[PDB]
């Protein structure tokens, strides 16, 4: 009916007027490119050959445009159409049209998209305004859009099959509007939380943590190789930190050349002892924690997500607020390039040896688990003998569940702390967690020590069968194993009942995600 | 032992599962009876006398790993991965390219992907035998390094060796089949397969009609680029209208088979199959058997890839940052077990709940073959030759090529076709 035509999503009002399918748009898969700048995006040649931008023929660009017209649609840097003053669109694709190849001022050559063009880049859903940002085109081989990795976080993009839409402005007026209101360097700091949207991420973050340690010493050739990738370099090699016996620079000394202008910042590394600030060695910091950047020079410290990440007061945020958005763009790009080449030198990996712990650590974990299971048994016996008394506001069932949960969670935490004590400096799980690039201490603990309690709907694994969780367990078993506790680590391997209970927990998480999307989307539409 | 010995001689002993059921050894139990039955996961561990948990077991599981389905049964060491990752691997293993059936030549099915060189996994679950994964495998074992090499493996992407790709690694064939039926609707209006003529047929296109044969159907073995005319069909106009089928844009294939038959109605019906050989590009999507996928970030030649002392360069480099948050330790255990199996010559056993295959045992086995216990290896940087300071985890892991390829997804629009009702750009 006429009402159904106009009514809902896919109706005229919302599906055709508020939003509509548009021309000059391209969608393809995204892949990483550390070599591109923040604002640069990588466009395949075919996408760039289909999409066109109309350029008014002027006396100063008539020669170049006539060359482009001569090349035509076939040769890539060419023109698809010529729009006359009358509005007649001579077609360069179909037949030479030798008389109609002439250009005069006022004609519009629909040239192909070239390097330096400003394009909007979008990922769905556009939750915030950083999801649509203006990028400067660079044409690279192969068929994927290629974007810098600092720009992945605003788009919420990972290169695992994601695709991104590209919209090309068709006028100089709208091109200037896009360039000024929406360029990526202008979007670094969000108004939502007055923090940078983008920061150093993934390999570069871990490699920055490793690079800025006190131990890192770089010889002359490595220093020159890394300065080759610093675009803002003044061409002067800093005097090495260690002149004799052999000239050796430091990772901090070279990172000081990345930091632009004269930027002052004080942060603290994630593994900063709380005692250090109160006690002596405040400004010496035996662990080389803390971070002090004076006059744009990294005097002391190790950088992590707290210094180079998306948080208020970070070195990135201070650079944006002090030096400007263009210099901050250069800052991001230079960090990524020189630290990625040093990472080519040092290297990074994850293996089984990272998951393995000491034999003593495994013994301590086992002892903690035994003690916890024994305490749970004692609590169950107290409840059975009716010695247990209800906690105010809770039933006897609820207070028993809370006590058992507390025992199991404390044992889980103690096993996790033992596993984390086991970790060496060389451990790569620890490296990624300390840098903040990926992972958490929870993940390390589950990998090495204990997966933990599997809980569904905020309670331990329910008695789905008649008065028992699985048929293998006896009826009325409230012990840790029966109700879902997984004492084996991922490396050790879950036992079959633990496997099923872990599947129950994972299923709950997946259901939560899937259900969440729609409710949040409705809320966002209503607010807007 | 009598039943197991007779089943072991199964053929030429005429003893089968039904005889096992008839003997009363095994029994079928449904969920309602599962509610009233005490089960033991394993006979030795549970039935045998110990500190008595239960002394009234009424049944025993044949093997725990059977709780998994068909797609989750291919996951090696699934008990060492996070639970959502096994769901992801089930979903992705439904999407891996392999030889789907042996009669794929006879079938003319639209959108058929078949891999050049499928391999059976070096680390395999026992239940795979009953899924026929050995007979019709999907994916290739590949030397994989878990390393951060040039930043092109960051996020979830994957660096690949271009030389290996050039030697046949993950090369596939995509067959697209087109169907066209000549039919008569009006008594004077009929559709005929014929090569359209510029003058005789009113509707025509710039697209080349020369490749069409006399019958109006392209012969097999002819290269057909995008928008060329596969089938030439003309309709008498009560001069003629062109209803000829064209290739899907950017198909760029070679005709494989052209079959001409009569359908149920008796009208002539033609099916034409087009081969497009798809080599891995830097947008194609590859996934391990552990629920972590990724597009190809870049392809480096064998000279550029990092190399070990023995001269081995990884076929695939995956970012280490994938492992920690996802906690897919089964991936690392599968690399270690694959290294052990490839050096030993056996095929590794990754059944979910073996309890006889620890990681420590695999490490001790790998130590005997001259490698580091934990599988790390000293890698030399391909570009400069200097040893990489951090020893890198390398091993043979089974990887699958998912059907999602960049060439199928790349799209662009500029003043193209427009819908009639909305007069807005079209969809798709």
């Amino acid at each position: 009916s006429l009402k159904q035509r106009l009514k809902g999503k896919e109706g005229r009002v919302r599906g055709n007027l508020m939003g509509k399918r548009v021309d000059f748009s391209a969608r393809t898969v995204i892949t990483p490119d550390p070599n591109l700048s923040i604002d640069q995006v990588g466009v395949p040649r075919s996408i760039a050959a289909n999409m066109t931008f109309a350029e008014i023929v002027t006396p100063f660009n008539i020669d170049r445009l006539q060359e482009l017209v001569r090349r035509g649609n076939s040769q890539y840097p060419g023109a698809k159409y010529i729009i006359r003053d009358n509005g007649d669109r001579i077609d360069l694709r179909f037949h030479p049209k030798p008389s109609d190849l002439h250009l005069q001022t006022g004609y519009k050559v629909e040239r192909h998209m070239c390097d330096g063009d400003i394009v909007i880049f979008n990922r769905q859903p556009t939750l915030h305004k950083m999801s649509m940002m203006g990028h400067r085109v660079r044409i690279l081989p192969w068929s994927t859009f290629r974007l810098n990795l600092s720009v992945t976080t605003p788009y919420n993009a990972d290169f695992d099959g994601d695709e991104m839409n590209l919209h090309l402005p068709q006028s100089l007026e709208t091109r200037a509007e896009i360039q000024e209101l929406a360029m990526v360097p202008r979007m670094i700091v969000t108004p939502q939380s007055n923090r940078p949207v983008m920061g150093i991420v993934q390999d570069t973050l871990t490699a920055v943590r490793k690079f800025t340690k006190r131990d890192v010493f770089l010889e002359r050739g490595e220093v020159m190789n890394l300065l080759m990738f610093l675009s803002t370099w003044d061409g002067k090699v800093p005097q090495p930190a260690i002149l004799k016996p052999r000239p050796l620079w430091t990772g901090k000394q070279i990172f000081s050349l990345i930091i632009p202008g004269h930027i002052n910042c004080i942060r603290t590394h994630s593994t900063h002892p709380d005692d250090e600030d109160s006690g002596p060695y405040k400004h010496i910091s035996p662990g080389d924690t803390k971070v002090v950047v004076e006059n744009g020079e990294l005097i002391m410290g190790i950088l992590c997500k707290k210094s180079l990440g998306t948080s208020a007061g970070s070195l990135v945020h201070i650079s944006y607020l002090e030096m400007g958005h263009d210099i901050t763009r250069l800052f991001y790009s230079n960090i990524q390039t020189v630290i990625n080449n040093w990472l080519l030198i040092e290297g990074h990996t994850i293996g089984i040896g990272d998951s393995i712990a000491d034999s003593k650590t495994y013994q301590d974990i086992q002892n903690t688990i035994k003690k916890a299971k024994q305490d749970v048994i004692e609590v169950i016996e107290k409840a059975h003998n009716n010695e247990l008394e209800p906690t105010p506001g809770n039933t006897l069932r609820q207070t028993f569940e809370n006590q058992v949960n507390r025992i199991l969670n404390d044992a889980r935490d103690k096993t996790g702390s033992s596993a984390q004590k086991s970790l060496s400096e060389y451990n790569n799980f620890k490296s990624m967690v300390v840098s903040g690039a990926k992972g958490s201490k929870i993940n390390i603990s589950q990998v090495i020590a204990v997966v933990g309690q599997q809980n569904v709907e905020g309670k331990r694994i329910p008695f789905g069968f008649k008065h028992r969780t699985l048929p293998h367990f006896i009826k009325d078993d409230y012990g840790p194993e029966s109700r879902g506790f997984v004492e084996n680590s991922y490396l050790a391997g879950l036992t079959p009942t633990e496997f099923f209970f872990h599947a129950m927990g994972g299923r709950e998480g997946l259901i939560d995600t899937a259900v969440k999307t729609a409710e949040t989307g409705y809320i966002q539409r209503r607010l807007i | 032992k009598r039943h197991i010995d007779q089943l072991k001689e199964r053929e030429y002993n005429n003893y089968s599962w039904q005889d096992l059921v008839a003997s009363g050894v095994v029994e079928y139990i449904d969920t309602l009876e599962e509610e009233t039955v005490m089960l033991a996961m394993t006979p030795d561990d549970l039935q045998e006398k110990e500190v008595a948990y239960c002394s009234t077991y009424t049944h025993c599981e044949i093997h725990p790993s059977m709780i998994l389905g068909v797609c989750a049964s291919i996951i090696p060491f699934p008990d060492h991965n996070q639970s959502p990752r096994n769901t992801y691997q089930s979903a992705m293993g439904k999407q891996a390219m392999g030889v789907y059936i042996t009669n794929f030549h006879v079938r003319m099915d639209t959108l058929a992907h078949v891999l050049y060189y499928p391999q059976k996994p070096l680390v395999t679950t026992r239940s795979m035998e009953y899924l026929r994964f050995r007979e019709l495998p999907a994916g290739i074992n590949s030397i994989v390094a878990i390393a951060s090499y040039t930043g092109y493996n960051q996020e979830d992407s994957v660096i690949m060796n271009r030389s290996a790709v050039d030697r046949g690694f993950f090369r596939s064939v995509f067959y697209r089949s087109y169907k066209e039926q000549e039919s008569k609707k009006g008594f004077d209006q009929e559709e005929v397969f014929e090569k359209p003529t510029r003058e005789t047929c009113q509707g025509m296109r710039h697209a080349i009609y020369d490749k069409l044969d006399d019958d109006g159907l392209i012969a097999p073995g002819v290269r057909v680029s995008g928008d060329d005319v596969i089938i030439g069909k003309t309709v008498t106009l009560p001069t003629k209208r062109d209803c000829s089928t064209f290739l899907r844009t950017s198909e760029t294939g070679i005709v494989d088979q052209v079959m001409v038959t009569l359908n149920q109605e008796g009208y002539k019906f033609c099916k034409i199959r087009v081969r497009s050989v798809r080599i891995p590009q830097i947008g194609d999507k590859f996934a391990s058997r552990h629920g972590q996928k990724g597009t190809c970030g870049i392809q480096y030649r064998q000279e550029d890839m990092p190399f070990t002392c023995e001269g081995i360069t990884p076929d695939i480099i995956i970012n280490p940052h994938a492992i920690p948050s996802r906690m897919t330790i089964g991936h690392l255990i599968e690399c270690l077990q694959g290294k052990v199996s490839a050096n030993k010559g056996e095929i590794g056993d990754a059944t979910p709940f073996n309890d006889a295959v620890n990681v420590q045992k695999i490490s001790n086995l790998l130590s005997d073959y001259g490698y580091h216990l934990r599988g790390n290896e000293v890698l030399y940087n391909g570009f400069t030759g200097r040893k990489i300071t951090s020893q890198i985890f390398i091993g043979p892991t089974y990887y699958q090529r998912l059907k999602h390829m960049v060439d199928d997804k790349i799209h662009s629009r500029a003043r193209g076709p427009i819908q009639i009702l909305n007069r807005q750009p079209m969809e798709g």
Partner: peptide
């Protein structure tokens, strides 16, 4: 999958 206070 961790605990009651964590995640499932």
């Amino acid at each position: 999958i961790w605990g009651i206070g964590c995640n499932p």
